[PDB]
């Protein structure tokens, strides 16, 4: 016996991965059989469950989330010049899936990102485009949406999203509101 492979802690729900102790914890954070937590930003909701329980949870506990149908929308964040840590959240539905669109203002910079209510593998089929439009000015960010399984905190932390500041916001804002064009496509 030269060494031992240990089963993923999520084997009980179907995971078949068995690995050395040194690369076990790494897998378990990434593992698809890990429970899903609440995709809403912040910690005021500590819910957890199955992927197909996520939308029901949002529909019961977070009824105030604005939702639009379509692959092309305008996400109009109102009151952008508010001081401090502020969030704007909405749902976009298209291609039979639901996407969470998030704009975060940190106490100052703005971070805008899109996440899929779905698995990491599902997220790979999609591209999103965020674009800010002004008079003969356009800033565009394009990327693969994150799965809510992974979340957006790490991405935001490494600026792996649309990142702009309050000065840039002024070039694109109208009446203290910023219209962000969001397009989702299958690639």
């Amino acid at each position: 016996a030269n060494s031992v492979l240990f089963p993923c802690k999520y084997a009980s729900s179907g995971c078949e991965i068995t690995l050395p102790h040194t690369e076990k914890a790494d897998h378990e954070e990434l593992c698809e059989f890990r429970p899903y937590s609440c995709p809403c930003p912040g910690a005021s909701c500590k819910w957890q469950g199955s992927l197909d329980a996520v939308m029901p949870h949002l529909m019961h506990q977070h009824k105030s989330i604005t939702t639009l149908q379509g692959e092309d929308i305008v996400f109009l964040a109102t009151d952008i010049n508010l001081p401090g840590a502020v969030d704007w959240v909405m749902m976009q539905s298209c291609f039979g899936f639901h996407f969470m669109l998030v704009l975060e203002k940190q106490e100052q910079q703005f971070f805008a990102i899109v996440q899929l209510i779905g698995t990491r593998k599902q997220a790979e089929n999609f591209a999103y485009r965020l674009e800010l439009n002004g008079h003969r000015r356009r800033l565009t960010w394009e990327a693969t949406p994150r799965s809510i399984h992974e979340g957006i905190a790490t991405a935001i932390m490494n600026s792996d999203c649309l990142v702009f500041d309050t000065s840039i916001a002024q070039l694109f804002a109208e009446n203290g509101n910023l219209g962000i064009n969001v397009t989702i496509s299958m690639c």
């Binding site: 930003p41 912040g42 604005t66 939702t67 639009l68 149908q69 379509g70 092309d72 929308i73 305008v74 996400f75 109009l76 964040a77 109102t78 009151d79 508010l82 401090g84 840590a85 502020v86 969030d87 704007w88 959240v89 909405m90 509101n177 219209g179 064009n181 397009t183």
Partner: peptide
Amino acid sequence: KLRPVAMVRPKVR
């Protein structure tokens, strides 16, 4: 592109 517009109100943490 046909774009519905959603007015989203801010949330403070």
